[PDB]
Each structure stands twice: as structure tokens, then as C-alpha cells.
């Protein structure tokens, strides 16, 4: 059973920045390995809110809102030390956090 020996995950609440940043790491992985990598679509999260829509009078309408947190993974069928060294310089950072740790 193929797995990874070091975990890299990307977490953002804005979907467009993380898709670009992931794409730069997929190419890094293909430059520092032997296979054709791409996006792991790990289950993206949504937290659920309900609020008013008039400040006082009538409630037949209300509002429900979403905020999503989009999850990517970025791993070879087994990674190498040459992948983490290249990855960590080439990762984007402006509204996504990459955590390189396991937990």
C-alpha cells in the first residue's frame, strides 16, 4: 500500500490562490521525481451559519451563508528529500498556509 513518508498540506478560504500555488508544487514534484503529478481533491470543508435579513420585523425569509475551506495535497506515491528541499522554496504564500508537518 502506497503512501507518503512526509506530509505537505495547503489550506485556504479563497479558492483561486490555492489552485495556483498547488500547480507550482505539482510541477516541482514532476521536476524532483519520475511520475506525472496533479491535484489531490481532498474533501473540501463548509461551516454553516444562519442570520436575520430584516433588523427586526418578519422572519419568513432569513439568510443562510457558507464559508468554505479548500484542501489540497501535493505528494508523490512515495516522496524524496529532493522533493521537500525544492518544494519549500517554491511554495506560494499570500493567503494560503502550507503546513509541512504531520500534525
Amino acid at each position: 500500500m502506497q503512501n507518503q513518508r512526509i506530509r505537505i498540506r495547503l489550506k485556504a478560504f479563497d479558492h483561486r490562490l490555492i489552485d495556483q500555488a498547488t500547480a507550482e508544487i505539482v510541477e516541482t514534484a514532476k521536476r524532483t521525481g519520475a511520475q506525472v503529478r496533479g491535484p489531490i481533491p481532498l474533501p473540501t470543508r463548509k461551516e454553516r451559519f444562519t442570520v436575520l435579513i430584516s433588523p427586526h420585523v418578519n422572519k419568513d425569509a432569513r439568510d443562510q451563508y457558507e464559508i468554505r475551506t479548500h484542501l489540497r495535497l501535493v505528494d508523490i506515491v512515495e516522496p524524496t528529500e529532493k522533493t521537500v528541499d525544492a518544494l519549500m522554496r517554491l511554495d506560494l504564500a499570500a493567503g494560503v498556509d502550507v503546513q509541512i508537518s504531520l500534525g
Binding site: 422572519k59 419568513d60 425569509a61
Partner: protein, 129 residues
Amino acid sequence: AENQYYGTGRRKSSAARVFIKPGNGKIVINQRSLEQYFGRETARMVVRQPLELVDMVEKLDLYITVKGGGISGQAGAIRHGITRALMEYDESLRSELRKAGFVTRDARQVERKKVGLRKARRRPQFSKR
């Protein structure tokens, strides 16, 4: 690679994976017997029906892995799953059933709970008097 024909059987948001081969009249579901998974319940009659319609209740073998159901329904993904795989013994078996309607992916999609309402379509009950 492939070594068995394969059906996907998606009905009611359950998926019957079905690996078909020559053998004897026989079912294994999730490495367990029929008395265990469908014992004496109406689901037992669901899964035998597509083998009985194709009269191969004695010479088809089956291996069944099923996810994402409830007990009677998973038998119903099996009802589509057996005929989905059996397209590669005869491709016109599945055509004629698709023309009658009698094999098809199930006709209901998801619908969500709506904004401000006590259910998917039920609005807030009020007397208002």
C-alpha cells in the same frame, strides 16, 4: 489491468461494484454470506432477480463490494450492478433494457435544506391568527 468484467450499478446514491466470472450459482458480498448481509429480508429477492431474468442462477459467480447505502437499497444498487457488468457477455442485453426503461441510473438527484425553511421544501408552519 482487467481480468474480470466490471459494473458500477449507481442507483439511489449507492454504488454496486460487481465483478462477474464463470462458476456456479453463487454470491459473496463483502467477504460474507447472503444469510449474514440480507438474511430473510426483501433485499434477498432484489439481488436474485437480475440472475433469474437472465436465467443464469446456476453458472454465474459474483463478488460484490458496496459502499454508501442502507440495507434494502444496496441490493437495489446490485440490481443495476449485475446488468452493468453483463454488458460484456452481450452488449445488446443492456441496449434493449435501456429502451424499456428497466435498466437505468436512478432518476433522483440531491436537493439541499433551503434558506430559512424547516426542511428541503417545507416552509415554516404558522397559523398567523
